[PDB]
Assembly symmetry: D2
Homo-oligomer: 202 residues x 4
């Protein structure tokens, strides 16, 4: 039931997207913030100092580089987006970044997850204490992955026609309604005219 941090990526009849949701037990005092071409997970007012207690709770969860949208549960969002910006195919950008940064060094060896999608293809990846996996996202269906339990891509009928709807869906919609401890969500959606961002709170 508790999947921790979750991300979804893919395309539906309305367009392409990436969605992100923070689920948390020990660090629930966080929200999402939209800035230029990116969405950051940051502490809510009055909890700024939490970033000094744990180095894995504040980071950009979404980055937009040209026609590409990158989503992840950590600072590797920037590592991956930067490589894409400097010229590197999606598979290698995710693969190299995850191989180098590796799983998080906390009490649970929390995995680093990520995905990236452009106009022609998409990839999803994860690195844990047991391995590294980067795979092409099925053209026929959107998928999601999480840091706990669902540490493997899983198909999902992700319905959404805007970033607002995408963020809401991963937060409280469909099968995601059953995953516990929701805190905040964000998403990027491209209906063909460019990437738009949005966030949703409980």
């Amino acid at each position: 039931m508790y999947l921790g941090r979750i991300l979804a990526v893919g395309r539906n009849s309305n367009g392409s997207f990436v969605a992100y949701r923070v689920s948390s037990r020990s660090f629930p005092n966080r929200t999402t913030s939209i800035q230029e071409e990116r969405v950051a997970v940051v502490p809510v007012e009055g909890h700024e100092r939490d970033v000094f207690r744990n180095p894995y709770i504040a980071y950009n969860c979404i980055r937009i580089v040209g026609d590409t949208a990158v989503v992840s549960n950590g600072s590797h969002t920037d590592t991956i987006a930067d490589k894409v910006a400097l010229g590197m195919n999606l598979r290698d950008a995710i693969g190299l970044s995850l191989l180098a940064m590796d799983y998080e060094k906390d009490e649970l060896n929390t995995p680093r997850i990520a995905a990236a999608i452009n106009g022609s293809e998409a990839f999803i990846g994860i690195v844990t204490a047991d391995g590294l996996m980067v795979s092409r996202v099925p053209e026929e269906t959107p998928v999601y992955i999480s840091t706990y339990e669902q540490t493997e891509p899983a198909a999902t009928e992700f319905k959404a026609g805007s970033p607002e709807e995408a963020a809401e869906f991963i937060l409280k919609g469909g099968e995601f309604a059953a995953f516990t401890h929701p805190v905040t969500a964000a998403a990027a959606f491209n209906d063909g005219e460019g990437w738009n961002l949005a966030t949703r709170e409980m």
Copy 2:
């Protein structure tokens, strides 16, 4: 799927009640004139006498398929066997050695985008990996069971009750034993086995 019993190159890795091992088998349709050769701490896949020039026709048919570096055994379907073994020798955990090598070398640029597969195992752990046109995967080998993977069809680790108590038996098994008997076009096989007193090598022919 089912009607496609040709798996191409196959490797197996794991431990059983007799010890730890890596096994390799060459299955081939277009390059069946090859054999395995044992050299110092390694086993190479090479053309049989009279076909030496094939290496100049295709750069992926001759290579070391097994390398032993200290307590570690490395197995793969290409020259990345050396890339990985070298990193292990210079100090690099198994997962990263395989991951970095496969990420860099990538799938083979032939008519089928033939994947590069590999595995490595030491006294405490083992990892298996593959890189294809659709991705990269390196995973810890289950302590409870040996696994195998191939370049075609079985491009994902699969459990196997690998019975063997020596490198000779391991090579024979992946060549004609158990479920491997059903995989077509066998050519030659090799294996490394460690019963606790060190890695020993062997090859088997049809």
Copy 3:
């Protein structure tokens, strides 16, 4: 004369060490903090929010993993230290981490610098918009490198017999006295009985 962030690594008659110094014009309100097996560069009281303005000003500058000391001007200190901890020679740990993380995406394409040293060898590295370099530290002499100007290893007669002295030296000693805008420094020293840490302020 402004070298930005500086690091030194090597051995002298007293032992082996790594030293780090923060020089800064736009973010001078920072100090160094010692925690378990590491030293972090963090904002001084009342400036915590600066970490949300620039993602490159707060990070562990020194990490100790067993017999190895790692020093760097960014979060790649952890990326490198983690690889060393999981088994990876110094050259590759630095090489892989810098190749993946790359130079910083600010107004100056600020390079990422790093060094690591154990009982038998040491390496130093840098990645800029013009390249990547990782090299063995000369056994005969300590060296230093910075993010601006001295973007290449340079020999230095680094005198010090403790982490306190090492931190002081890179802050105000020898040729470092001429490098401007000093803010805070830290160092790790091993006289043969283990790595000890220290920080020094102006």
Copy 4:
């Protein structure tokens, strides 16, 4: 005076190029062969079996991928070219390939050298038992590097207006005339209308 394998890269008033020269003491029975978009170093008739004695003597020394020319002293020519073809900037393609493949495991720890150049930029690299280096080629001057002695980029007034002239020059021209044991050379030249290849023998 013996530099082993040598490569040059850069641009002059006539165009851009990469040049390669095999110098050898123990394996002089080799020549260069032009194939589709590539030049291979192979044994001369009657010495085919040498490839089974040493794994580092036969390989593609030049690969052309679209607007990019790649040159190297080993099979990493393909590793690098393939990454460029699949989308990867020149610096990272060379950096990743050299980091992974490393120096050659022979009696001399022979380095792996490489360079790549397209319409807007060029990079040169080397990996030895002492390190890894990938750097931007100066826009103002061509440079060369070798496996022995000149294991660092060096400026060269490389005169040539065609691949034939480029191959000849690195083989017997200018300062290269002084480097001993020449065997065979090859080059790729782009005067603006595409990459053309050529080889030259003593």
